[PDB]
Amino acid sequence: IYWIADQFGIHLATGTARKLLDAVASGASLGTAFAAILGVTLPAWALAAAGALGATAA
């Protein structure tokens, strides 16, 4: 995700997701604020993948 946002970056969230990206990067443990940002374009299962065994820098 940290690689697709650069090359592609088709889903630029410079609205509210910004305030989150400035926190999740240090401790992405949100369960409601993360699903509200990864629900506009990203899937729903991705929320469960964030835990472990999933893309962390992709």
Topology (elements, then pairings):
Elements: H1 4-7, H2 17-27, H3 46-49
Organism: Lactobacillus acidophilus
Protein name: AciA
Keywords: Membrane, Plasmid, Transmembrane, Transmembrane helix
Write a structural description:
There is one protein chain. The protein has 58 residues and is mainly alpha-helical. The chain has one domain. It is 33% helix and 0% strand. The protein is built from three helices and no strands. It has helices at residues 4-7, 17-27, 46-49. It is globular, with a radius of gyration of 11 Å. The protein starts with a helix and ends in a 9-residue tail after the last helix. Keywords: Membrane, Plasmid, Transmembrane, Transmembrane helix. This is AciA. The chain crosses the membrane at residues 25-53.
Q: How much of the residues is beta strand, in percent?
A: under 5%
Shape: globular
Q: Order of helices and strands, N to C?
A: HHH
Distance between the termini: 4 Å
For the secondary structure, the number of strands is: 0
SS element count, helices: 3
Largest sheet: none
Structural category = mainly alpha
Which percent bin holds the helix content?
25-40%
Cα-based radius of gyration, to the nearest Å:
11 Å
The figure for the number of domains is 1
Protein name: AciA
Keywords: Membrane, Plasmid, Transmembrane, Transmembrane helix
Transmembrane segments: 25-53
PDB class: antimicrobial protein
Q: Brief description of this entry?
A:
The chain has 58 residues and is mainly alpha-helical. It contains three helices and no strands.
